[PDB]
Amino acid sequence: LVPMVIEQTSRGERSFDIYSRLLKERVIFLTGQVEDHMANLIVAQMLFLEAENPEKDIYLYINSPGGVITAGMSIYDTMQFIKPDVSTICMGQAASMGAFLLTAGAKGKRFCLPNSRVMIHQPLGGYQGQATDIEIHAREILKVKGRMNELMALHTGQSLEQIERDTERDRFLSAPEAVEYGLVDSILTHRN
Amino acid sequence: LVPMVIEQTSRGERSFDIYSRLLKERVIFLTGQVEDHMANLIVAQMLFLEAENPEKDIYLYINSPGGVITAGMSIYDTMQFIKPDVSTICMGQAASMGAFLLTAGAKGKRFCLPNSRVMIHQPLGGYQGQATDIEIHAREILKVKGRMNELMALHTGQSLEQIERDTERDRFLSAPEAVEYGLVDSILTHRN
Amino acid sequence: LVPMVIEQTSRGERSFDIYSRLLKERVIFLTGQVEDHMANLIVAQMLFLEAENPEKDIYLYINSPGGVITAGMSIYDTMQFIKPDVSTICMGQAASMGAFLLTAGAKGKRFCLPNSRVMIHQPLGGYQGQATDIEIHAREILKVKGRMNELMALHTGQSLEQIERDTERDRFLSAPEAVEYGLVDSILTHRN
Amino acid sequence: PTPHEIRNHLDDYVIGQEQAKKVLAVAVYNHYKRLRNGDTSNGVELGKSNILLIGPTGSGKTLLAETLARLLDVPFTMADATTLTEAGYVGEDVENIIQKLLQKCDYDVQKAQRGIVYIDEIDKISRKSGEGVQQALLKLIEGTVAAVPPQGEFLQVDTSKILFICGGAFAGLDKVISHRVETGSGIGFGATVKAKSDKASEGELLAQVEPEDLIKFGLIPEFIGRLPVVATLNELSEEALIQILKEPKNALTKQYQALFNLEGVDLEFRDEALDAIAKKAMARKTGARGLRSIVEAALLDTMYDLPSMEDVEKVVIDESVIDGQSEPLLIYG
Amino acid sequence: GELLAQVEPEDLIKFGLIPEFIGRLPVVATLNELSEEALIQILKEPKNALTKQYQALFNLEGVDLEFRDEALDAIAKKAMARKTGARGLRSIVEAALLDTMYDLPSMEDVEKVVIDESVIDGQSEPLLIYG
Numbered sequence A, B, C: 001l002v003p004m005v006i007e008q009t010s011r012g013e014r015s016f017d018i019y020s021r022l023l024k025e026r027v028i029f030l031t032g033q034v035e036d037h038m039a040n041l042i043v044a045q046m047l048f049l050e051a052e053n054p055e056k057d058i059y060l061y062i063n064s065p066g067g068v069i070t071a072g073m074s075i076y077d078t079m080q081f082i083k084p085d086v087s088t089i090c091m092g093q094a095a096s097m098g099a100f101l102l103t104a105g106a107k108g109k110r111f112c113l114p115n116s117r118v119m120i121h122q123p124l125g126g127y128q129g130q131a132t133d134i135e136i137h138a139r140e141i142l143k144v145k146g147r148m149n150e151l152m153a154l155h156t157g158q159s160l161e162q163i164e165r166d167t168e169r170d171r172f173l174s175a176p177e178a179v180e181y182g183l184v185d186s187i188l189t190h191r192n
Numbered sequence D: 001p002t003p004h005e006i007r008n009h010l011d012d013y014v015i016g017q018e019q020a021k022k023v024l025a026v027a028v029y030n031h032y033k034r035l036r037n038g039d040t041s042n043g044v045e046l047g048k049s050n051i052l053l054i055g056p057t058g059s060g061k062t063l064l065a066e067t068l069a070r071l072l073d074v075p076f077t078m079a080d081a082t083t084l085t086e087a088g089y090v091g092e093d094v095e096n097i098i099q100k101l102l103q104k105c106d107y108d109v110q111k112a113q114r115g116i117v118y119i120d121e122i123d124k125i126s127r128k129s130g131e132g133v134q135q136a137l138l139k140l141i142e143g144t145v146a147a148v149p150p151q152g153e154f155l156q157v158d159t160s161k162i163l164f165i166c167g168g169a170f171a172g173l174d175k176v177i178s179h180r181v182e183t184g185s186g187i188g189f190g191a192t193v194k195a196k197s198d199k200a201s202e203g204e205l206l207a208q209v210e211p212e213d214l215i216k217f218g219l220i221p222e223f224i225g226r227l228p229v230v231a232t233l234n235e236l237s238e239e240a241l242i243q244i245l246k247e248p249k250n251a252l253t254k255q256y257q258a259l260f261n262l263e264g265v266d267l268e269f270r271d272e273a274l275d276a277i278a279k280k281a282m283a284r285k286t287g288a289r290g291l292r293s294i295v296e297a298a299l300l301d302t303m304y305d306l307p308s309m310e311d312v313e314k315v316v317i318d319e320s321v322i323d324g325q326s327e328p329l330l331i332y333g
Numbered sequence E: 001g002e003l004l005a006q007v008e009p010e011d012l013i014k015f016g017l018i019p020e021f022i023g024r025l026p027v028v029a030t031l032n033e034l035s036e037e038a039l040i041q042i043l044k045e046p047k048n049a050l051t052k053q054y055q056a057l058f059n060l061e062g063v064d065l066e067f068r069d070e071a072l073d074a075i076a077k078k079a080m081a082r083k084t085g086a087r088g089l090r091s092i093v094e095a096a097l098l099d100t101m102y103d104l105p106s107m108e109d110v111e112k113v114v115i116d117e118s119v120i121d122g123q124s125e126p127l128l129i130y131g
Ligand SMILES: Nc1ncnc2c1ncn2[C@@H]1O[C@H](COP(=O)(O)OP(=O)(O)OP(O)(O)=S)[C@@H](O)[C@H]1O
Pocket: D013, D014, D015, D016, D057, D058, D059, D060, D061, D062, D063, D120, D121, D168, D169, D244, D248, D287, D288, D289, D290
C-alpha cells in the first residue's frame, strides 16, 4: 500500500501518493535491482523535471545492490545530458551499478548517509556456445570493463591503474572511506 | 481490503484509508520483514512529515521480526537526520533490525506495550566462492557487527563489552526487562 | 508504481502518469523483449500521434535486447507508412530487433547515447517435425534473413555483401562505431 | 493629429514596443476620427474598434493606454477584472467606473462618449464564475444603453461611442502558440527546452497569435469577436530596462537629478551604475515597477543627509555604491 | 514587521482600495511593531507614561510606589506576547496592581509599595512597608 498525501494549494486540495509528492519537488527514487523496466522509468522522470525547470537541481537516491549493466548506462547518459545537475545521495547501500551512479553525480553535490555502504566490483557476465561466439562475447565484456574503469577515475579523480586494481574483487568502503576515495564529497549526518 | 475512513473538515468531506488517516497525524507503520522496498517507503514518509512541520514529533510503530540489515540502516540515518524527534513504540514484537530501530528513537520518548517482546542478536550473513572473496566478505560482516554494537551502547547506555557478550546469541527480553536494559524508557499500559 | 504528474493548463489541473505525459509530446517507449502484445501497443501510439498532427516528428526510444522478428516487422512498416518522420534514439542497448529498428528511422534524425551499444545478428529460429515440414521452415527463415539484410543496407548505406558477412555472428559496436557503420547519424552527449 | 504625429509623441514617454505602438496608434486614430464625424453625412454607420493588449506582466501595457490618453484631453479610467466586476452578486459592475470617467469631464455625457475605459487582468476571468463574467461583459463591450442611472433626473448613456481596451498578462499563452505553429516536443532528448534565464523569444512568438489560440485559452468566441484589433508586447530584456532609466523623458534618473538641482547639488549616474540596478531588478521579477523603489532606496541614505550637509557642490553615485560596498562620493566645493 | 516592509500595489487593490488610489500615494511609510527594548523606553521616558500615571493615582491617599528595573523589562515582554502594541502595557500593569488597589485604601498605616518581577509574574504578592 502506498499512502496518499494531500498538498494544500490556492487552487484547492490535490490528491497525490508518497512517491508522487516527492517527485513534484524534483526527487527521484532508485530502489530494487537495476533492470530495463525500472531504468526506463527513472529516465522518464529526469526528462520531465528538465522540461519543467532546466535549472533546478534534480535529486536521486540510490539504494540498490545493482543489476544489468546495460540498463544502468542509460541512466548515466541521461544524468550527463540534461542541463540540470543531478545530486545523488546514497541511502542504505550502493553496490555494482549503484556505486557507479553514486559517483556519476555533479561534482560537489554528491552525499551519503553516515551508515551508508558502497561496494565496487568488475563487470559480471558469461556466455555459452561455440568457440567463435565465446571469443566475441569475451571481448565485449572486456571492453565494457575498460570503459567503466575510465569513467570511475574521471569522477573520483583516482588514476586508471588504481581503479583497475581495486575492481579486481569486491571492495567494501564505509561512508568515511568513500569521501577519501572520491566516490562522494561529504556526509550528511544531521540537518543544520 | 483497507477500510476507507472519512475526515470531517471545513472544506468538506475527504476520502482517506486507515493508513493514510493516521499518516496525516504524523504516524508511520513498520510491518513485515525489512527490505529495500518497504524501507524506502518509510524513509519517504519521514521526509514528507518533516517538510510539513519540522517540530512536531513523528511516531513510528515497530512490529516485525527483522530483515535486511542494509535496508534498516537507511531508516536509522533518516531518524537521526530529520530535526523532528522520532518516537518509536514497540507493538507485538521487535527482533533483529526491529530491536535496533526501537532503541534508535529520541531519548525519553521510547515506549513499548506491556506484552511486547524485543530480541537482539548478532548480524547474520554468508558468502560462497573463492577463498579470497570469502575473506573479504568475512571482514565486511565483522565490521558491521562492531558498528551495530557501538550504536546500541550509545542509546541503551550500556558498556560496549556488555553489548557484545549479550549479542553472541539470541536474547529474549520482556517489556519490563527492556526498560532496565535501556532499549526503552517506559511502558504504556493504560491511557491516563 | 508509476508516478502521477500534473500538467498546468488554462482549463485546469490534469491527471497524467509519467509515460502518458511524455506521450502527449509525441514520445514513445520501447522497453522489454519484443512480442505481439507490446508491439501492437507501440503501433497504436504511432497511429494516434499521426492523426493529431501528421507533420510533427514522433520520437521513439529503443531499449531492449530484441524479441520476435515477426512482431518487430509490424513496427517497422508503421514507421515507414505514417507521414511523420520517426526519430529513433538508442538508450542502454539495442540488439537483435532493437538494432534493426534503430537504423529504420528517418535519415538524418537517428541518434544514440554516448554509452549506448548496438548488436546485430542473423535471424534465429528452429522447427521440429517431418522432413518435408523442416524443409519448408528452413526456406522461410532463409527468406527472412535475406529481406532483413537488404533493408539494413538501405539505411546504413553499406553493400549487401558487407551486411551478410557481418551478420553471420553477433557483432558488438559502440556508439562511435555505429555512426561510421551507418546505423545512426550522430551522438547526443550533452544538450546545447 | 495623424498617426505619425501620435507615434512621435508617445515614443518619448515610453520606449520599446515598436510593433505595439504602430497598431495602437492606428486604432486610436481610426476610432477618434470617426467620433469627430458626428454629422455622419454618409448613411453608413461608424462602428467602434475595440483594442486588445497581450503581453507579459510588467511590460507596460497599462502605461501605454494611460500615456496615450494623456496626449489627448479626453478622460481615461481603469478597472480590474480580478474582482469579477458585474451588476450583481458576482461583483461590482464597472458601470460605476464609467460614471467616474463622466465626472472627470465636468460631468458632461457628451464628452464622456470619448472615453478610453481600460480593463486590466482580463486574462484572469478565462473559462475553466469565470465564464459568467465574460458573458455579462459581451454586451457592455458593444453598444448598450443600459447602465447605472446617473444622479445628475436619471439618464441612460450608451456604451457604443466609448472606446474599450481590454488587456491582460496572459499566462501560458506562449505554450499554446508554440504547439500550433512551432514544431518539436517539449519533453525528451530532441525536445527544444527553452532556457528560463536565456533565449527570451516569448515576445516574438506572441506576434503570431490568432483568434484560435484565444479560444483554447478559455475566452469564449463571443468575447474574442468583440475585440477585432489585437496587439502584442515583447518582454523587456536586461538592456531594455537600462534604456528606460535615461531615454524616457520622465525617467527615474531625470526626476531625482532634477529634485537635487533645486538645492544646487547635481547628481550624475554613470553607465556602470545603471546596468547594476537593472541586473538586480530582473532577479526581483518586479520589472520596471520595482526600478523606482530600488533606485530610491539606494540614494535614500544620502538624500536625507544631503540638505543638512554643508559645502556640497555635486554628488555622484558609483557602481560599488549600489552593491553597498561604499557610499556616494561627494566633491567638496 | 518584515512582511509590511515589502509591499506591492496588487496587495492593496486586493484588499479593497481602488487601483487609482494606490497610484496617487507614491510614498508608503511602513511602520513596525514596537520591540521589547522600545516598550520599556515608552514605559518610562514619556512624560505621560502609564508607570507615572499610577504613581500619581496613589498619591491621592498619600501612598507612592516604585517599579524595579527588573520588573520593567518583564512587563514589556508580556505586552509583546499580547500583540496589542503600547495599549497592552496599560492592561498588564492594571491586572498586576488590581489587588493592590483593591485593599490598599482599606488598609491603614501604609507608607510605600515595592513591586518587582516576581510580584508582577504572580509568584508573590506586592511588598508593602508600614509607616
Ligand atoms: N515601457 C515602459 N516604459 C517606461 N516605464 C515602464 C514601461 N513598462 C513598464 N513601466 C513601468 O512599470 C510600471 C508597471 O508596468 P505596468 O505594465 O503598467 O503594470 P501593470 O500593467 O499594472 O501590471 P498588471 O497587468 O496590473 S499585473 C509602470 O507603471 C511604469 O512605471
